[PDB]
Write a protein that binds this ligand. Structure first.
Ligand SMILES: Cc1cc2nc3c(=O)[nH]c(=O)nc-3n(C[C@H](O)[C@H](O)[C@H](O)COP(=O)(O)OP(=O)(O)OC[C@H]3O[C@@H](n4cnc5c(N)ncnc54)[C@H](O)[C@@H]3O)c2cc1C
Ligand SMILES: Cc1cc2nc3c(=O)[nH]c(=O)nc-3n(C[C@H](O)[C@H](O)[C@H](O)COP(=O)(O)OP(=O)(O)OC[C@H]3O[C@@H](n4cnc5c(N)ncnc54)[C@H](O)[C@@H]3O)c2cc1C
Ligand SMILES: O=C(O)Cc1ccc(O)cc1
Ligand SMILES: O=C(O)Cc1ccc(O)cc1
Ligand SMILES: O=C(O)Cc1ccc(O)cc1
Lengths: 476, 476, 476, 476
């Protein structure tokens, strides 16, 4: 289990090939755009060594201590243990950090437990899992092709190598060229270039699954506009510390060593990877715990805002808060059923129930925009009446303490709260979270079509056919 | 455990004081408006003796066999057993029968297990429970006051006795006068006149809880317009058998024997009855199982309709069906968590988790109208192109077999299916089901306000206050 | 201009070839299922001769009086006159009659004014228009193909003649075989078998447009389940008089005389018929006036229900009623702009603005279900507490007058109102109205795709490109 | 009519008493946070002198040229002229500038035309109007009280002077103390401290209406967190130029000269000010034109994004764009009816129809969040894949030109477009626009309650009562 200091030293020593506004980022641990999230990830690692949480966040094995997200669960109790670790980490950042490493560790853990799925590359998968686990490395990932001409398949873009494709194979490995559209949280040691969780691979040239150090020659991470509002925790309570960053991933004829290849030119293996290995189930397990944490945060802020300005006395405000409570209970329910109905897959890996998790990941993208809307409807103008800590410290401070106090809340506390509510919804950082919730697991349109096609609808159709027997009997 | 024949004989011998269109109903077992639902309830009772389901629907105790809905659960396994019985009964009618007796048995079971709550009337409650159980009697109930002037409390209506109130007390019992607005499924032996599950009692004169035989002198059940479309199972697959009927309940100075009184003039006891006894938890448990069954039925019909007319090839149709699947999984999740997180209440009664059940009963009223809408959007004109079995049997039958066949479905089967879809959504019977789902457990506006006030929001508010400590530290 | 008596005599003398439950309907003017709507249509005709409305509903020309819906408008004032007639007729039935003849007269009027569009069949169109006008005949129509396998085109169904297609041509006319899925209000003298307003014709064999007397040999109208609740105006205020009926239209090798053919085997002419002639604009004009009338009716009922039970004192109830007001104003706005921005088409026919009408017909299908929902949310249990006039006339009448009175409303008036609200939303008749609003003008999915493709989006795209010039200048 | 240079010189010479992060803003024309919007307002003024638009934006009177927003309309044509000016100005900034001066000029124009309403202060109003008109000054306004304890009225806050109240009256004028919660676009010469458009004044101490130079001693504007993303038009196409700024307005015992007082201590006059004068109608007229412009901008961006990435080939994407078209037509319709149904008020001032405008201002707050959502659903990950112009100018430029090109769109143009879409929806600037649309004209909850209470519902209730006469006749 890594400490925060080790993580920081690792990034400083071998930083990811990040680019920000046309320039290479030499040290993300001190760069204004990245130092915040780096400190945040470091704090998550440090929590693993806090006596109060060590038993929750890590497990011992043969004289070593590993992060819980690497635990191959054998019982429902083990599954619950993984869930508690997901939740504890999520709560540290109010569920605002969407790509903490444990999500991807869940994927690799499942891939390893179900390694036989990968055939000749099985050992590579098992060895990679042990590597990430033993070193407790941080990972980032990118599964989608560049958004260029969505009317055509991967092989029908303006160039054969817009998507990441194999240029050639050598005795050392494969050379790939192309790009992945999005990778969140590039402040990692490794990047996972895996198949989509729902879209078809299309052609063998693109049917790939491999991992690389983020400093690999030819590999580039091009950052989007930064959303860090500033460093003041009062003025920017969340963007000052949880801005994970999103980036386009470029592969300029990058060499991928054979030991890092997990799938090569096999469309079928790519198209069934997450479902067959159980990675889909486990990664979605981290997600349901994460969204439960996020919903709890919104509930707390909504309640405090309403009480803070005396709006809680109005029925419709109470109803809006109750709506968030209903959604919170829904997510807790999916989480519980996912663990309680868990069963072993074809490789003997215990996986949480897909029905419950498909329910959660397809319902939350609909619930989140409404939860966000609720905060807007409760806060109203209070959400944009955001003086700075500098204003409270300035000449008009006394006036602000009078005009911005709450029903029974001091002005500084009131503004601190609304600054947080704003950062969770209306700042560039907050608004991005909305788009993130709507799309991170895939396009809802195709996620729903996917659910329709994979779900076993026969039992329900049969019950209706049986009910209709009496209807057709009138013709006998 | 009662048989269907015993139930039918009981209603024929001592029929409820029903009125339909200005006339007394002498025999509901043969009356055109009621014989269908009577046969349906009789079939539910008969199922208790079917070897295939006897172990699911009943339990043995001291040489006797009782209906599962009377079982006082001691373990989570017992809770699961009650749930399986709720589900099996619900599936028989595609979740379209909303007031089967087991819902109210859950209430009385909890009242009895928590009988100490009722003080001096505790024995009356325990004895009544044993009575309903031993005789396996059918019950109906009415908890709301007449909808006259909702701007005023129960004591502020045009007359003191519009709501049911105590006129006087005697050595034999109490005399009550007034009315209850709605009682569904009056084809029962007993009627429960209990407090509201969310509204305050208002005044001691109305703070009551008692039970009476449905044939009691002075007691009248005034039926609304019947929604039975006909007796043909082809033409009216559901309304011909599951029209439970709704009625206004009138009390013309009715005498309630002291042994049938459970609460008298105690506003506090009325206002906390369901929550304190656990009746709220158990009755909501029957509901979540029931709505899961109902959603499964809609999923089956939606899938069959789409496949039937070849609409399943369209993405948005697949998405609509997947939406129903998401809702089905949500209800299954609430159900699972309700049982898995069950704990004993103050009286030692094991009760299913209120959070999960409050989630289910406050979310489904929102989901159902959408599920209904989905069927409409899939079926389109097929939902009103409803020839009768008589048309298929007539001169134009051959033409109908050609023009109303489906992609790979025969015409008679196609129309049988759409007749069912129509009866589940657009017939008078189907449309009522929508209003029922929206309101049966209470007015959503006040159900949400109730949830807001009772829910413990402190943990979430505290997490936010803790997060804001760093914000306020900038002023130190 | 026809009188009601003339209409009734015409149907009695030469009734449409209607079938109900396997039997031919000999006299729809006296048949229990149809006499109500027949009397309603007769009343609309009679209104044309009422001194108070004669100038609104008819116009004089060369010694004759014609129905306003036949007026070929030359000025915006004439357009307004047509609109006022649409509205006056609609108000008679609270906007619940969706297929009154004036909707189709608008179509034929436009077809005639733009007759050159039809080439060699131009004279047939002009003559048919004069025929309908002079005789003031009632029409019904069917534009859709049987819902069998929607995954395939008209030419890909189980049989070439499932859709109406030409079998052969003779010296007398054409022989057609097949069926149309739906025709509402078959209590007419003529039936219009025209092209779709948005779907492609597919093949020349089906590219048709013709009209026939409803008594034509080989032509059959197969009625769906009747939705007439009864004849009591108290118990069934709307279904007793406005049940238009829907039916499948069968063509058993029907001969269509050459003089009744308007389009034959021309896919292009079929695909552009309504837009090119202006029929789309005019028929949608009747619709916007009709939906404005319907919304006014719902507003009135919602307001009366809220006041009736004292629910109007609650904020959210006031908000729901205000929502209906917003929708009413939206429809009035579309109506006004449709007339004020009217311009002449390629044939010199003044047509109301398509933008405003496309807005109205694509927005109302979304607004109506919500308007219906609002009535449900306001009425609650009052919507199913529906005793009959027979109950008020019976022994319990006195009790009902006490328990079902409103805040300041007598019981009989209260129940009459809720019976109406129920008939507008939850009776089989009311529920059908919802499906009708959702689909009558076409499938929303394809109506929206149609709007996207036909709308000129260039002006807006150009404004954005211009705005972006400054963005690209940074690279100069 | 002012030129941009005159406006800039005026702000530089006598700047508003602005505060940003604890410091006074000495020159907003050069300050990084305000120079953008100042240049934007200056450009609006300059447009008044462009030969192409002079006749649209100004009118001549007695040798002078005045801004169109000051024109007292005498005919519907004049009303249309005002509307065209509103639209032309709005289009310059894609409808993103919500508080351009013409909105408030509409208010003052109406106040002046209906000056008799103000009694003894009538001349002050007329003189102030002439002042703003002749000097073509820019105004800002604040109508709401500090959000402190919304459970209590203005007189029930923690201090009597939290809301702006009269401290004392002298021979020179009145001294006021307190604050207004929000004023958008404080880069103005004058500030209007007027009554609410829907909330009651509460007490005479707060029933005020006056105007002051923004440099008045004791008057302070405390700015919220700035949302200017940067100065690059490529990177921040909108926030670099249209960030109007919102601020809390503080009154530290400010002296208001008697000539600047329009209403003093008259609750009734305050509560009916906008409706009686017609200011409500005219200010809402500017709004409907503005929202039409805004919707046109979103339509253009949505269409370009869809075409840009080839997503336009998908049905649901076409449907989403068509949805925006429907909303655009709805707003155009409200606009048209508002002008066409205009009538003179009690003071002889021609005012646009309130029904149409109440419809528009109560419907758009519901439509906008959906329009914003649509852009998110179309753009998906493209909305956060935002490299900078600096990245295109840097070493990886060539790679970006390959991976971020569109179907038939160059990469730089593609990113410029998505940067704009992002700035319109997800940047801090874009997100604020959503909250703005939801609340600028008032809290929807109370706006709807206001509409319910003021609307004449009698005609609709009467039509229903008339329809029910036949129902009650059954008892005769
Ligand atoms: C903040 C944020 C963070 C993210 N982080 C990561 C990450 O860490 N790693 C990673 O791999 N991904 C990440 N993503 C990407 C995410 O998984 C994708 O946005 C999502 O899967 C949907 O695909 P897309 O963005 O390519 O949109 P597209 O496929 O480009 O779609 C654009 C639009 O076109 C439509 N359309 C396109 N194709 C079809 C089709 N075939 N059928 C129907 N409609 C179609 C869509 O429905 C939508 O309306 C992130 C996204 C966001 C917004
Ligand atoms: C088909 C059907 C079957 C039913 N079966 C049964 C049954 O078997 N047994 C039984 O006891 N009940 C039954 N009911 C009744 C059901 O529980 C009630 O409809 C429900 O609890 C809501 O109360 P209400 O109908 O009295 O409506 P109301 O209280 O009359 O409300 C009407 C409207 O006024 C509003 N309003 C009124 N008061 C307030 C308030 N204080 N605050 C805010 N808004 C207010 C509501 O929000 C709503 O918009 C049934 C109802 C239906 C529709
Ligand atoms: O699978 C996809 O196509 C999108 C996706 C990307 C990252 C992720 O973690 C889940 C889904
Ligand atoms: O509790 C209420 O007031 C309405 C209600 C009625 C019957 C029921 O079973 C549940 C709730
Ligand atoms: O009237 C209000 O109370 C809010 C409001 C504020 C400014 C404005 O322009 C319109 C409404």
């Amino acid at each position: 289990a890594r400490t925060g200091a080790e993580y920081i030293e690792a990034l400083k020593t071998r930083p990811p090939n990040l680019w920000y506004k046309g320039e290479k980022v030499e040290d993300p641990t001190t760069h204004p755009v990245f130092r915040g999230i780096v400190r945040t990830m470091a704090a998550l690692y440090d929590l693993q060594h806090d006596p109060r949480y060590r038993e929750v966040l890590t497990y011992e094995e043969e004289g070593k201590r590993h992060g819980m997200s690497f635990l191959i669960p054998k019982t429902k109790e083990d599954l619950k243990r993984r869930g508690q670790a997901y939740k504890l980490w999520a709560d540290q950042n109010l569920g605002m950090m969407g790509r903490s490493p444990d999500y991807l560790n869940a994927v690799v853990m499942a891939y390893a437990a179900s390694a036989d799925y990968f055939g000749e590359f099985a050992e590579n998968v098992r060895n990679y899992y042990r590597y990430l686990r033993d070193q407790d490395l941080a990972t980032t990932h990118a599964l989608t092709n560049p958004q260029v001409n969505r009317a055509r398949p991967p092989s029908g873009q303006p160039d054969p190598y817009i998507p990441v494709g194999v240029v050639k194979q050598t005795e050392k490995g494969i050379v790939v060229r192309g790009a992945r559209m999005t990778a969140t949280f590039p402040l990692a040691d490794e990047v996972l270039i895996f198949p989509s969780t729902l879209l078809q691979a299309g052609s063998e040239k693109y049917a790939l699954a491999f991992a690389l150090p983020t400093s690999t020659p030819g590999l580039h991470f091009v950052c989007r506009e930064a959303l860090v509002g500033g460093d003041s925790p009062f003025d920017h309570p969340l963007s000052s510390r949880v801005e994970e960053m999103d980036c386009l991933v470029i592969f300029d004829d990058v060499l991928v060593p054979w030991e890092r290849v997990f799938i090569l030119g096999n469309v079928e293996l790519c198209n069934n990877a997450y479902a067959a290995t159980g990675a889909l189930n486990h990664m979605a397990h981290q997600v349901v715990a994460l969204k439960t944490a996020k919903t709890e945060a919104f509930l707390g802020v909504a309640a405090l805002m309403a009480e803070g300005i005396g709006a809680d006395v109005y029925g419709h405000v109470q109803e809006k808060i109750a709506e968030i409570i209903v959604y919170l209970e829904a997510m807790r329910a999916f989480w519980t059923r996912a663990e309680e109905e868990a069963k072993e897959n074809a490789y003997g890996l215990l996986v949480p129930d897909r029905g419950a998790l498909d329910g959660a990941r397809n319902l939350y993208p609909r619930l989140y925009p409404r939860i966000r809307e609720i905060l807007e409807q409760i806060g109203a103008s209070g959400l944009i009446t955001l003086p700075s800590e500098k204003d409270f410290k300035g000449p008009l401070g006394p006036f602000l303490e009078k005009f911005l106090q709450g029903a029974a809340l001091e002005a500084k506390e009131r503004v601190a709260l609304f600054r947080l509510a704003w950062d969770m919804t209306l700042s560039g950082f907050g608004a991005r979270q909305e788009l993130y919730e709507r799309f991170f697991f895939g396009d809802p349109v195709r996620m729903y079509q996917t659910l329709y096609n994979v779900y076993n609808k026969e039992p329900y159709k049969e019950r209706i056919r049986a009910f209709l027997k009496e209807s057709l009997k009138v013709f006998e």
